[PDB]
Amino acid sequence: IVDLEIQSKDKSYAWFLTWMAKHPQRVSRHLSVRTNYIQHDNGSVSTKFSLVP
Amino acid sequence: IVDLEIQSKDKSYAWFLTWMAKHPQRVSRHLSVRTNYIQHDNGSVSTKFSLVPGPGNHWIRYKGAFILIKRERSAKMSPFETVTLTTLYRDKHLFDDILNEAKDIALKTTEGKTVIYTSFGPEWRKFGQPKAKRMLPSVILDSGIKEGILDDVYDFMKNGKWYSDRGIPYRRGYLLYGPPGSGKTSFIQALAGELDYNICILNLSENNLTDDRLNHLMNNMPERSILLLEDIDAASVTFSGLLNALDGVTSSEETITFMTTNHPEKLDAAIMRPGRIDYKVFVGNATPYQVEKMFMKFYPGETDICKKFVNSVKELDITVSTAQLQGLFVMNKDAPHDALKMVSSLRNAN
Amino acid sequence: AKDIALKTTEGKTVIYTSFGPEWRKFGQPKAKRMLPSVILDSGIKEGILDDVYDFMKNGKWYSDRGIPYRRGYLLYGPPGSGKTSFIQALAGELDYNICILNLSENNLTDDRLNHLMNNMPERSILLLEDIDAASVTFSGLLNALD
Amino acid sequence: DFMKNGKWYSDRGIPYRRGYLLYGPPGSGKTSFIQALAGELDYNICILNLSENNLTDDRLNHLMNNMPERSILLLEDIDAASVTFSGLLNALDGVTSSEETITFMTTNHPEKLDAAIMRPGRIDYKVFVGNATPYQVEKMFMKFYP
Ligand SMILES: Nc1ncnc2c1ncn2[C@@H]1O[C@H](COP(=O)(O)OP(=O)(O)OP(O)(O)=S)[C@@H](O)[C@H]1O
Ligand SMILES: Nc1ncnc2c1ncn2[C@@H]1O[C@H](COP(=O)(O)OP(=O)(O)OP(O)(O)=S)[C@@H](O)[C@H]1O
Ligand SMILES: Nc1ncnc2c1ncn2[C@@H]1O[C@H](COP(=O)(O)OP(=O)(O)OP(O)(O)=S)[C@@H](O)[C@H]1O
């Protein structure tokens, strides 16, 4: 009675990860931290922390 | 009712272990040892044993949530390494505060020390213990050279928006060319100390380095740092790849890069284009202004012996270097008369 | 997911770098360089822009005559003249990405190069900086280009 | 004089580090004097072979930084030289160079060395350990036949 799609290191895999990160309905009890630069013209560039699933 | 958060080998990782070492309200078993090269002014009695949380599980309180840390390694040990946090109240908002505090602790530059980063694979790594800041008045360059470089650097750092309004990439490159022992590397240390910036020393003659790794290193420098390319004329990197790394679509933004050479003519005109090397200044052999100021630095106070010394140097008609002058003043510590007697020794070079 | 990842930010261009047999984003997106900021000679910018727009508009005309729908541009000149700057400006104008490819990279093979040139992201420009610099073979590069 | 004046170097910002070169014909007592002086100072000897192939620049910087305390760095046959020339030069005097180390170098061919390595911030003291002089002959005879 269930279905299951798998996609593995595909060009849509990174797209799916980015979409999942942007999802507001996500309820994820597991998080990962990866630093990212927030480049803004005012002042100087700074790093930022992203809580990906 | 729990929410776990992990982070692999990234920039946030080492910041987090440095923060967790300093955290007071910590209940850690399973600790580890770490010898380090601490220093006292008279002499560095190194090998101070430091106890770090190490692998295993740890309890920290922080703001009142009783977070469980879990450091563990895998099949290998810097491969296969990770820490893990767990909060028991769905208070994941504390994780970003933890990360920000770790970032602030790590980014906090020691008030009189300069940090040196070295290319280790595709990312930078701290090299040794931080070295004491070299002061700008110690470096005796020719008249207007130090001031000209400092004015150009401050003008570049201040005018950030001006670059972006006109579309010019916010990036400046400096070349110090001249004879050996003229003050180039010493001036790099002094200027990095003045700006309170770190130094990322990069060796292109490293055979393991490649173009993709070079671009990653140039684009992942730690904040508030200066890229140093010692002996840019020495050059698995490719010439076109280096040229694009210096100025190209792949080149990074908001970086100061410094390169030094003893053979400027060995450089191609492409690398010396005024968009890759914007400022080039000749750090030459010692001039009488340099001789006088070097003597006054090593022997403060009396000037008549300094006058006799610079006259004798002028009569010696030899292209002395400031490294040679420093060596002579080091030989005669606190003895200006002995230095004036031994000034003739600068003539010999074998 | 495709729409989110394919949408371009309003004022930045993505840069792709050849990592193995496929492309990947390099760093953060860089702000678009504006075409008026690139001072080329008279008619040069306008001529190149007209030729590019004429090529992108006439997709069907190429197919009807049987010509392969593919164009190649060479900007040659002295160092520091505007070549790379114009590439950035034009890619920003078209809202295309730049796929930088280094042929002098030793791990690159002919099969890998064909796969890279046949798997570029949609709406992107292939940039071969210093084509004169050249594990790739001459015949393999020639057949890959046309 | 160098070991005593630790603070004097720090006051003027000079890196606390000295380099010595003994050059001359073979069998003049260079290595023997290194052993004697290390025994006198009660220091260890760290002998480093630059010609060893698996040594790289990063490894050499780590070795020259992580020397055991109260030891002498010995570079026998400096003229013999996977290490790079620039990497060696920056290791001996550069931003990456360590602090409070005595380094001793020997060679039978001093003229084979570049100006950069013979710089008086890399090699501070250079003395010619030559063939036997009549004073040396007399003192050797007195040592062997008191
Ligand atoms: N102008 C100067 N003022 C003060 N100290 C100097 C000066 N020039 C050289 N020195 C000292 O001499 C040594 C070598 O100087 P560096 O600047 O480190 O080397 P360099 O001048 O860059 O030459 P290289 O071999 O090309 S790195 C250091 O111990 C410096 O403290
Ligand atoms: N025509 C131009 N108009 C405006 N800025 C220019 C122009 N040509 C060069 N520049 C600036 O000069 C620098 C380098 O220009 P590039 O176009 O990257 O160099 P180039 O012409 O590609 O030559 P190379 O060395 O072969 S990459 C950048 O800071 C540009 O902004
Ligand atoms: N001046 C000397 N005084 C005492 N013994 C000496 C002297 N010169 C040589 N010898 C003896 O001969 C050996 C050779 O001297 P070393 O210093 O070891 O070699 P060397 O002088 O460095 O020559 P090389 O071949 O360049 S290592 C020593 O181990 C002593 O046994």
Coordinates of C-alpha atoms in Angstrom, one line a residue, chain B residues 19 23-27 59-68 94 98:
Chain B
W19 CA 34.3 26.6 22.1
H23 CA 32.9 26.1 28.1
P24 CA 32.9 26.3 31.9
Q25 CA 29.6 24.6 32.8
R26 CA 30.7 21.3 31.3
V27 CA 30.6 17.8 32.7
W59 CA 27.0 17.0 29.2
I60 CA 27.0 20.8 29.0
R61 CA 24.4 23.1 30.4
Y62 CA 24.8 26.4 28.4
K63 CA 21.7 28.5 28.9
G64 CA 19.7 25.8 30.8
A65 CA 18.8 23.0 28.3
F66 CA 21.4 20.3 29.3
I67 CA 22.7 19.6 25.8
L68 CA 24.4 16.2 25.2
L94 CA 20.0 27.4 21.0
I98 CA 26.1 27.9 20.1

